[PDB]
């Protein structure tokens, strides 16, 4: 009823949900793509896929279990889902995969087949997923030569050069008890899980701490992947944002909610209380846009992504959007701040109070790894309601006004002006 957190060597964290009809048990490691290098980039993604390999999944399915794995920038997860009663069967599989097995999943035929699978996977993403590919390039240029610049799926070049040894090296260096948290969500009790874990013994690399490196840094820059054969222009643009556990974490998320998301083809989306919408609908400057406040351990990105077929008016799209951002520093109104509060609460509620145990597992593990605990919506909502117009203006004057930007784009971006023209729009002339 408040999320329990116990440690006996292995940190166990659970979140009991009485309305849930299933249960998820897994392990979340405090290491992701941000802990790789340009040459082993994609190793985590390769691990995810061998864990989700047919051999491993068939074994789990026979037991009535479903496997899930997510590779993020700061973390990595491996979850098993089952009925509330088969919760102990999940632990056995989990125990087996990360303690008993090794040479079973890393066999020549399984590794090569899995490698070939992720290779075609990544190739398709880079070849067809334009909005996400652009967002990945935003991170790449914004944090270039820094941990946060590496794509989570890895790069084709490094992927084709990866061997079983690379996987093992990463596992020995990151899949450690000191860098992990065993999570339990859905319909399960803490005692049931802690005792079932405390039932077994061993340690498997005890006291071993993960590798350390240099911190993430934001660099005003841009990467342009022009492709005149594509039907649209896809653009992502952002300034240095807030890291997780930043004092302005919510103020930044609220600022992003002010401008929000938009889908020109959805009737209700066109009626939102967003001033930018009055400027962009007259000549239909875009098909959609979405503002974000991405937060990581060392840094973050605040900005937006947009897609448009109006290739001759991209300059107006960017101009109007950045002119609106200017407003956060000098003229954002009370009702805009109040509307943002309500919608932010709804966003967080939908994110944290989702009816999915695997989602809760990922969120719970990631947070307890970073701050040792998980913040409740009750506390989050209180912080949000305390945000004032002066807080937004103070934050904007620091993060937005006359600040460097990172830009990424693909498709028909001839109309996207030079860096300086876009950068100049981060402020307004004053007397």
């Amino acid at each position: 009823a408040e999320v329990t957190q116990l440690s006996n060597g292995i940190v166990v964290a659970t979140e009991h949900n009485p309305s849930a009809h299933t249960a998820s048990v897994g392990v979340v490691f405090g290491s992701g793509a941000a802990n790789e290098n340009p040459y082993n980039n994609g190793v985590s993604n390769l691990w995810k896929n061998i864990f989700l390999s047919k051999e491993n999944s068939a074994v789990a399915a026979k037991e009535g279990l479903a496997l899930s794995s997510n590779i993020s920038r700061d973390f990595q997860s491996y979850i098993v889902s089952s009925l509330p009663g088969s919760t102990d069967k999940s632990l056995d599989f989990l125990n087996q995969s990360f303690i008993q097995q090794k040479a079973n999943l890393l066999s020549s035929s399984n590794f090569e087949a899995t490698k070939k699978s992720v290779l075609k996977q990544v190739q398709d993403f880079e070849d067809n997923d334009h909005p996400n590919r652009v967002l990945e390039h935003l991170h790449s240029t914004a944090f270039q030569n820094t941990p946060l610049s590496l794509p989570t799926r890895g790069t084709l070049e490094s992927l084709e050069n990866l061997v079983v040894a690379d996987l093992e090296s990463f596992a020995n260096n990151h899949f450690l008890n000191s860098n992990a948290v065993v999570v339990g969500t859905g319909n399960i009790k803490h005692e049931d899980l802690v005792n079932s874990i405390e039932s077994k013994n061993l340690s498997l690399q005890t006291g071993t701490k993960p590798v350390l490196k240099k911190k993430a840094a934001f660099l005003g820059s841009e990467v342009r992947l022009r492709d005149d054969t594509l039907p649209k222009a896809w653009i992502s643009l952002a300034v240095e944002g807030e890291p997780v556990n930043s004092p302005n974490y919510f103020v930044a998320k609220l600022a992003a909610q002010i401008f929000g998301s938009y889908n020109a083809f959805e009737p209700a989306s066109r009626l939102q209380g967003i001033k930018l919408l009055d400027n962009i609908q007259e000549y239909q400057l875009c098909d959609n846009f979405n503002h974000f406040s991405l937060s990581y351990k060392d840094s973050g990105l605040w900005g937006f992504s947009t897609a448009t077929r109006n290739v001759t008016m991209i300059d107006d799209l960017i101009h109007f959007t950045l002119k609106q951002w200017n407003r956060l520093t000098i003229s954002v109104t009370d009702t805009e701040v109040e509307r943002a509060k309500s919608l932010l609460k709804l966003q967080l509620g939908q994110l944290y109070e989702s009816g999915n145990p695997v989602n809760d597992a990922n969120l719970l593990g990631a947070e307890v790894l970073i701050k040792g605990s998980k913040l409740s919506l009750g506390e989050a909502f209180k912080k949000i309601d305390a945000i004032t117009v002066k807080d937004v203006k103070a934050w904007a004057g620091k993060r937005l006004w006359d600040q460097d930007i990172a830009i990424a784009g693909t498709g028909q971006i001839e109309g996207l002006l030079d860096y300086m023209r876009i950068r100049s729009d981060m402020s307004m002339m004053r007397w």
């Binding site: 005003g220 342009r224 022009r226 991209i314 001839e414 860096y419 950068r423």
Partner: protein, 93 residues
Amino acid sequence: GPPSGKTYMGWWGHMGGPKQKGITSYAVSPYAQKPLQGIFHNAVFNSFRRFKSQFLYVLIPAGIYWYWWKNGNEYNEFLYSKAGREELERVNV
């Protein structure tokens, strides 16, 4: 608006060039760069580009004309001096 004649330059979004693909460009903000603290010394070996590579195309024609000028000027001066009186009358009339 009235129908206008086709030209070889358009505008942003339809400049009139060929379809571009496969080229990726990267740039860094001027704010993140060294405050132009390397004008001289670092750009001295690159300098004289319009010199070493272009000076002969300028120098030879310049030398030809300057010497042609100096030659004619010295002769005119001679013709109008006491010693040049006889040749002056010869070439003038």
